[PDB]
Amino acid sequence: DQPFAWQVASLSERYQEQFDIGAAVEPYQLEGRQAQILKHHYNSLVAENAMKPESLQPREGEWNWEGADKIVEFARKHNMELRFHTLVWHSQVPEWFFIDEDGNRMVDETDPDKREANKQLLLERMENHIKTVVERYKDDVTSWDVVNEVIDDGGGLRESEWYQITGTDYIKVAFETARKYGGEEAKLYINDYNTEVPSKRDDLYNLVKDLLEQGVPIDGVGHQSHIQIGWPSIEDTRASFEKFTSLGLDNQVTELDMSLYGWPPTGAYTSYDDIPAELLQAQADRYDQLFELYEELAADISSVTFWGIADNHTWLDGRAREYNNGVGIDAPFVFDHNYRVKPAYWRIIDLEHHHHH
Ligand SMILES: [Ca+2]
Ligand SMILES: [Ca+2]
Ligand SMILES: [Ca+2]
Ligand code: NI
Ligand code: NI
Secondary structure (H helix, E strand, O other): OOHHHHHHOOHHHHHHOOOOOEEEEOOOOOOHHHHHHHHHHHHHHOHHHHOHHHOOOOOOOOOOOHHHHHHHHHHOOOOEEEEEOOEEEEOOOOHHHHHHOOOOEHHOOHHHHHHHHHHHHHHHHHHHHHHHHHHOOOOOOOOEEEEOEEEOOOOOOHHHOOHHHHOOOHHHHHHHHHHHHHHOOOOOEEEEEOOHHHHHHHHHHHHHHHHHOOOOOOEEEEEEEEEOOOOOOOOHHHHHHHHHHHHEEEEEEEEEEEEEEOOOOOOOOOHHHHHHHHHHHHHHHHHHHHHHHHHHHHEEEEEEEEEEEEEOHHHHHHHHOOHHHHOOOEEEEEEEOOOEHHHHHHHHHOOOOOOOO
């Protein structure tokens, strides 16, 4: 019978002098056992949802700070670093950004001179969003996800509304604006998933390299690390970290979780007791090797953030349900759905160093 997360040695303490250990949170998780676990095991936080653009500015000038403020106050009180997710993102983006002053959709404008006017209007709206958020939280955020998921999985840039209306200029202007109002001390990240896939890694590298050569202020790369038990490979993960280090960039692991399933997560288990112990052991073996890699590359990695706390709250549950006709759970963390430690906890708290040849 495994002990509860509040009864075992601290993860963040184990990784002192190597990297911070972070968790994604909701404001309603900052009480009770989840808050107890946060304070005991983590020294960095990120808002799972309360700081995304539609949460903060759902309508132009309608600012919703309360939930984000609660996370900031918790980080202040318990000496936790805070990442910011996220200033600019194509996902669930507030539609009002992309509507011109006549009420028409900018993406559909066919007149060239009007398209140029839309580009300037949209960039001003983006600048004002970044300015307002950075001015409020500058002294509380130590890593800014300035742009998120701007590379397409099929190659090249993601053809979101941001890209259709502004080209790459929204990326350039976002970093310049975050630097302007955050100051030279703000640490500015480009965040993405599947950064271990060589073709996507290379596209992100080529984009960031070109931007750096133009003077765009970029300090690091966020690797979301939504991974599986058998994918991606340790060697591809190593290759990706090193390539961005070669540009002088920090690496952060920003949204780590290890699904029990492939992609798509078909054939998900409908109850936690249906999970075979051998599957949690395989997860433990993989987490061991993953954090062994992180230790080897600790000079290149400033923080490792899990996209949640314990298995009772993860976006992977909704992903399982999406692909299994509305039913299904996932178990991606080192703490299980009752807050008891899993085999993976023991394998990343330990000091084992005998290799696995
Ligand atoms: Ca480090
Ligand atoms: Ca779950
Ligand atoms: Ca280990
Ligand atoms: Ni720190
Ligand atoms: Ni090992």
